[PDB]
């Protein structure tokens, strides 16, 4: 029984989830997504 509980605790520890949340939040803050600016943009492209 204690062997099984230790095993399950080990897998659950390997099955944590908050770290990916933290990583995604950090990446979102770093990239600094935004929409404010002009209504629409006109750009230069040399279409093939």
């Amino acid at each position: 029984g204690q062997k099984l509980k230790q095993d399950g605790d080990s897998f659950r520890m390997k099955l944590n989830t908050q770290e990916i949340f933290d990583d995604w939040a950090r990446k979102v803050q770093q990239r600094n997504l935004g929409v404010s600016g002009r209504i629409f943009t006109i750009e230069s492209t040399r279409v093939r």
Partner: peptide, 28 residues
């Protein structure tokens, strides 16, 4: 004095209008 139709509706090709408005966006 039979009147003739005046200047027709112009096209003002998309490229020129886009360039003018790109300039206006750049200056604003």
């Amino acid at each position: 004095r039979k009147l003739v139709h005046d200047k027709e509706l112009a096209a003002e090709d998309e490229q020129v209008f886009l360039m003018k408005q790109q300039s206006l966006l750049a200056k604003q």
